[PDB]
Each structure stands twice: as C-alpha cells, then as structure tokens.
C-alpha cells in the first residue's frame, strides 16, 4: 500500500482537480461563441443592447477564465506527477496536442485582450466582431486539441511497442484517432449548449426577479433558441458517439446500458439499479436505438459485456451517469424547445415563473450533465489503460504525500469555487 493507495488516491485527486477545472472551462469554450453571436446580432440589428450583453458577459468571462487557468495549471502539472510511467511512454505522443490547447488559448487570449482593451479606445463594432471571431475559434481549437488527447487515450495508434517502449510515432494518426471526431464534436456541442443554458439561467433569474425586460428578455429569447439548437446537435453527436462506442468500445456502452448479454435487438434502459453483484431492482427499459436509425438495421448485434473480460470491464455504476447525462439532455432540450416556441411564439408564457424557474435551473443542470458525462466517458476507461497502454495500477508513485496534498488541493479548490462564485455574483449585482 506504499505504492498502491496512490492508484486510488491519485484518481481521486485528479477527479477533484479536473472536476473543478471543467466548471471554469466549458464556459471558456461556449461563452465566447455566444459573445461573438451577441455582438454580431447587436451589429446586424443595430441594437446596442446585445452589444452590452457581449461585454456584460466578457467582464465575467475573464474571472471564469483565470480560475480556469489556475486549475488548468494544477492538472497540467498533476498529470506526469501522479502518472509518471504513463507519460514515460505516451508523453512523446501527448506532448503536442496538450501544447496546442494552450497555444490556441494564448492565441485567443491575445484577441480577447485586444477587444477587452480596444472596445474602450478604437473604432467601430465590426472591428470588435473581427476580434471576437478569433476568440471562439481559439476556444474550440483548445477543445479540439486537448480532447484529441483523451480521444487518443481511449484509442491508439501512431506508435509501436518495443518490449514496453513506445516509439515510431505518427502525430496525426495518434491525434486524429477514431474517437477524436465524436469526442471533439460532442464536447464542443455540449459546451456551446451548456454555456447557452448558463446565460439563459442569468436572463431568467434577472428577468424573473427585477423584471428589467430591457436586456433580460432579449437575452433569454436568444440564449434559449441557441441552446435548443446546441442541445439538438449535442444529442445528434451523442447518438453518433454512442454508435462509435457500440462499434469500437462497447465495454463502456454495455456497462452504461447493462448489456451483459450480446443480442440483435437489445433494449436501452432509462433508469435501473443493479448493485455491482447482479441485483436488478428498478427496471425501466425500451427497445434498441443505436441500430435502427444509427446502423440502419434494428437487428445489428450489440456486443455484450460478458464477452468482455472482467479484468477488462469498467464498473456498472456507469449506467446512472448515462441516465443523468442523457435525461438532462432531453429534458433540457424540451424546456428549451418550449420556451421560444410556446412561451414566446404562441401563448406568451415567458413572464410565467413556471418557465423562469426551470430556465434558472437550466445551466446548472447542463453543467451537472457535463460532470456526469465526463465521469461516464472517463470511467468506462480505467481498465483499458492497464493493457494496450500500461498498467494503471503501475501508473502512480507514493501514498503518504498524495493523501495530504489531495486534501490541501481539496481545500484550495473549495475556496476557489466559492470565492469565484461570490465575486462573479457580486459583479452581476453591481450591474456594470
């Protein structure tokens, strides 16, 4: 246990860091797009209220960004620290994208900084749109490149194993692996979406309470509509990624949907409870999706989990996450799909609290679905790294340091999150 506790403690710490990181990140990814769009709408419409929401957002986008950065550094460093032998092999291959994430981030950060400190000096709004285009591009570029890491972690190749030593590396093969498309896509979509619901959750708060129709109805009207779109795309690329899994890594998917047994027409599950050792409790399941319109043939035989080695299978508590993530997906999509439809273009329900409440919950639900989803996609992953890559069990270092540093960091982040939330509310209540 002087070099096995960390096998767990590390996982635990890393979770605690990155879990935080993401709160301050998908915002970093989705917000700038929304900002760009708001500017663009304000410009195209000559409505200098949207143009106020762009900066009204940016002003906090900053604070989000920084907290993002520090946690980013944290994880960045923690990487090789907690998992040396991993990087001993794969570092050669991961090095680049990881860099390109932050490069893309600096590239965006320049223009972000320009807009931030030229919108109050130099000329014309288009010339500030053109500064806000590179930002979102650089944001999504981060995600592309950094996700290419995870995507690669999930799947080879671009390497060769000389009795353990990883060599003969092709950049773009390892970078542009089979998972990369679905990862990049689903991640971008479910991060445009998330922030899209996050802004709606401000507009619905501010509009619900001190009903300054002014910005706060326009905000909702846009953010909700875009949120709908992004949730739809998100779901599409969800089905896509699911199909990818069903074809290439059903170890996850079969654990997500508890398909121990391999079959042609295999029903999905809405929610259940199988305690790790075959204890089927709540059982609500429907016939199969990722075959009928995905594979175009309902009787496409889904691989079963039994057919996966039990040293190669991930946990069964994964299902719950799929439930969470997907159901949030659909529900939230519905809320979105109604708001603009029914609450605006039909029966003027906007001013009803019955929406504003749900729309206040909107963003938090999405972020939850984010954390959940990440847990799902990453935890279906623990028992493969130990094979085609290298033993997870033999990836960590020492115990009596990690256990404490974990708690130090725990505290640190606890403070971060809270403080950030506080300041980030204070600002909005100051109304600049």
């Amino acid at each position: 246990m002087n070099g096995y506790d960390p096998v767990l403690l590390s996982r635990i710490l890393t979770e605690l860091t990155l879990t935080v990181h993401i709160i301050y990140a998908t915002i970093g990814v989705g917000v700038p797009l929304m900002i760009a769009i708001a500017q663009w709408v304000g410009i195209r419409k000559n409505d200098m209220h949207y143009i106020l929401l762009a900066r009204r957002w940016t002003r906090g986008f900053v604070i989000t960004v920084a907290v993002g950065v520090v946690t980013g550094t944290a994880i960045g460093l923690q990487l090789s620290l907690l998992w040396p032998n991993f990087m001993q092999l794969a570092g050669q291959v991961i090095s680049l994208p990881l860099f390109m994430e932050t490069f893309a981030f600096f590239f965006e950060a320049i223009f972000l900084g320009i807009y931030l400190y030229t919108w109050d000096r130099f000329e014309n709004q288009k010339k500030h749109l053109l500064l806000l285009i590179p930002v979102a591009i650089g944001s999504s570029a981060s995600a592309m490149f950094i996700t290419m890491v995870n995507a690669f972690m999930n799947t080879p190749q671009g390497f060769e194993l000389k009795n353990g030593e990883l060599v003969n590396i092709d950049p773009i093969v390892a970078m542009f692996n089979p998972a990369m498309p679905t990862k990049v896509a689903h991640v971008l979509a479910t991060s445009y979406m998330t922030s899209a619901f996050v802004l709606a959750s401000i507009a619905a708060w501010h509009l619900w309470k001190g009903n300054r129709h002014i910005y706060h109805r326009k905000a909702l009207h846009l953010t909700m509509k875009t949120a709908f779109i992004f949730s739809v795309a998100s779901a599409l690329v969800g089905d896509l990624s699911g199909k990818f899994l069903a074809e290439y890594q059903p170890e996850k998917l079969a654990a997500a949907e508890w398909h121990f047994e391999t079959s042609s027409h295999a029903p999905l599950i809405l929610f259940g409870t199988l305690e790790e050792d075959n204890e089927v409790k709540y059982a609500l399941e429907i016939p199969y999706a990722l075959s009928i319109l995905a594979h175009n043939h309902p009787a496409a035989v889904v691989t079963g989990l039994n057919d996966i080695p039990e040293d190669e299978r991930p946990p069964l508590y994964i299902h719950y996450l799929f439930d969470v993530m997907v159901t949030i997906g659909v529900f939230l999509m519905v809320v979105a799909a109604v708001y603009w439809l029914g609450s605006i273009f039909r029966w003027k329900w906007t001013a009803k609290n019955w929406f504003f409440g749900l729309l206040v919950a909107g963003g938090p639900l999405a972020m939850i679905a984010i954390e959940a989803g990440w847990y799902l996609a990453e935890v279906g992953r623990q028992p493969w790294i130990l094979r085609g890559y290298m033993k997870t069990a033999e990836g960590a270092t020492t115990s009596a340091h990690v256990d404490t540093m974990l708690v130090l960091f725990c505290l640190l982040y606890i403070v971060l999150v809270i403080a950030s939330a506080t300041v980030l509310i204070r600002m909005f209540r100051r109304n600049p």
């Binding site: 002003r59 906090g60 604070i63 960004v65 920084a66 907290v67 950065v69 520090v70 946690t71 550094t73 944290a74 960045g76 460093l77 923690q78 090789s80 620290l81 040396p84 032998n85 990087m87 001993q88 092999l89 794969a90 570092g91 050669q92 291959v93 090095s95 680049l96 990881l98 860099f99 390109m100 932050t102 490069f103 600096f106 590239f107 950060a109 320049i110 900084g113 390497f159 030593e165 060599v167 003969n168 590396i169 092709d170 950049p171 270092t397 020492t398 340091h401 990690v402 540093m405 130090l408 960091f409 640190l412 403070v415 971060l416 403080a419 950030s420 300041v423 204070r426 600002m427 100051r430």
Partner: protein, 330 residues
C-alpha cells in the same frame, strides 16, 4: 539526438523567456504590494491591476509551453522528475492558484483588492523559491550523493548551501530585473526610488547573485566536478554577463536611455542563465536522464519545435506589440 539537444536548448530559453516576464510580474506584485501596503488604494490597485495581470497571463504560457514541451523530448523525465518532484509542484501550484484567484477576484472585488495583497507578498516571492527547488534539484540528487550514490533523505536536502545559492540566484535577480524593467519606462519625476532600489538590487546582483554563480562553482567542486569543469568552460559567459551587468549598471548610474540597460540586462542574465544551463548539458540530473536516453520518435520532435516556434512567434510579438500600444510612435 541533435533535435533532442536543440529541443532542450530552446525550452531552456522558454524557461528564460518565462523568467523574464515572471521577474517583472513577481517583482511588481510585491514591490507594488509594499508601496501600496501603505494606503491600500482601490483606485491605484484598480488602475494598476487593470494592466499587470496580462503579464502574469503571458508568463504561464512560457511556463506551460516549457513544461509540456520538455516531456515531448524526454518522457523519461516525466517518469523520474515526475515521480520525484511530488510535493514542491503542488505548493507552487497552490501559490499560483492563489496568485490567479486573486488576480481575477481583484478585477471586480475591492474587498480582496486591498486585503489579499498579503497573498501577493507571500506568493510573489514564495513562487521563485518553489521553482528554485526544482531548478536546484535538477542539478542535485534524490538518490545521487558522492562516492558512488547513497540514498538521500529528501526531507533534509532542503537546507543546503547550494540551494539557497539558487534561491539567491533567483529572488535577488527577480528584484533587480524587475527593477530594471520598471526603471526603463519610469517616465515620471517619481522614478528616483526605482533607481535606488534598482541600485540595491544591482548590488545584490553583483553580490548574492554573481556570488551564488560562484557558490555553485565552489559547491560543484565538492559535488559535481564535470558540471564544475563545464561551468569553468563557460565561465567566460558569466564574465560576459557580468560585463553586460556592468553596462546596465552604467546605464543605471548615467543616462535616461535605458533601452541599452534592458538589452544589456537581457544579454546579461540571458547568458548568466544560458551558461548555467549549457554547463548542466548535455544531460538532465541522472545518467539515465541524459538527452539521448529513452530515444523518442523525432518527427513529433520537429512538430514540437514547430509548436515552440509558433509559441514564441506569439509570446515575443505580444510583448513587442504590448510595447507599441503604450507608445504609438513606431
């Protein structure tokens, strides 16, 4: 393995490139902290910290470019250095977390703006040391002592006359470099203090720093004779550096054109750091961590170099344009 030597050659200059801005920011968020400890003015902290932070943002780019680059050329460091350097990292990261958290919170938080400058006092200095430990150990040992390698109590290698030599090689030069940068554009009648403190830190440079450049030499005689020999083979660079320092000192003593003070400073600590690296090369602490060990595929070496070029090609012009937005004189 040429590409592998070029990689570390450039990444060393990423660490230097970091050192440059980091000096300015950590000097600022410290000297400014004392100078505003008296009268914690939110007007002044607002006006200051509206433009300070971008630097600090730029720093972490150097830092992380370095950190992410190095392991692309040397995953075996990610094994060894990674597995060894378990604690100082986390601390440094805490210190950073603090720095940034408050850099953000202060932007729209006057409560933190005044009280949590304490934190900038703490971190602004503590960070240099917390890097200096790794920079130290990188030419030291975790299980590497004298006769033929005795296992070392890492808990008691903290206190050593070679480590504080690096703490001095850092802190004081942070102070001095920062002071020189602040002086360079000290376009005010109230710039007399900057040059006096800059003088003190220049005297610290001629002393504690260039002193430590020799403390390292007179520690290596008993520690690492190969490194000592290399360092004597590049001591002329430390001389050159001392001469450039003398040039920056002459610009200090005399004229208002501190551009040459900054160039002289640049080449000064650039060479005083670049030799300090060169001597350590070609290897990284261990004989198993020599540049050519655990031979990697060298295409992604070229790609990584491309990425470093792409990086610097922003890092530098960001600052070159940052020093044209404040002028508009071409």
């Amino acid at each position: 393995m040429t590409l592998e030597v070029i990689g570390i050659s450039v990444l060393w200059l990423f660490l230097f490139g970091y050192i440059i801005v980091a000096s300015i920011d950590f000097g600022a968020g410290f000297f400014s902290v004392y100078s505003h400890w008296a009268n914690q003015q939110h007007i002044l902290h607002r006006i200051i910290q509206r433009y300070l932070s971008p630097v600090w943002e730029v720093t972490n780019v150097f830092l992380v470019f370095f950190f992410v680059g190095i392991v692309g050329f040397f995953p075996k460091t990610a094994y060894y250095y990674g597995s060894i350097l378990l604690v100082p990292a986390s601390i440094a990261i805490v210190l950073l977390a603090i720095r940034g958290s408050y850099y953000a919170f202060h932007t729209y938080g006057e409560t933190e703006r005044n009280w949590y400058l304490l934190a900038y006092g703490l971190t602004g200095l503590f960070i240099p040391a917390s890097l200096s430990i790794v920079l130290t150990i990188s030419e030291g040992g975790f299980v590497e002592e004298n006769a033929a390698g005795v296992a070392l109590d890492y808990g008691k290698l903290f206190a050593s006359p070679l480590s504080w030599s690096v703490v001095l090689l850092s802190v004081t030069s942070v102070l001095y470099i920062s002071a020189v940068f602040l002086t360079y554009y000290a376009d005010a009648a109230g710039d007399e203090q900057a040059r006096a403190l800059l003088r003190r830190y220049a005297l610290l440079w001629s002393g504690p720093t260039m002193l430590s450049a020799l403390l390292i030499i007179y520690q290596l005689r008993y520690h690492n004779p190969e490194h000592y020999d290399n360092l004597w083979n590049v001591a002329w660079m430390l001389v050159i550096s001392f001469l450039f320092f003398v040039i920056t000192v002459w610009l200090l003593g005399r004229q208002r054109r501190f551009g040459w003070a900054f160039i002289a400073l640049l080449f000064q600590y650039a060479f005083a750091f670049y030799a300090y690296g060169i001597s350590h090369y070609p290897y990284l602490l261990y004989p198993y961590l020599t540049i050519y060990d655990g031979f990697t595929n060298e295409t992604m070496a070229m790609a990584l170099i491309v990425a470093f070029i792409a990086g610097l090609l922003l890092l530098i012009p960001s600052l070159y344009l940052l020093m044209r937005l404040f002028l508009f004189n071409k």
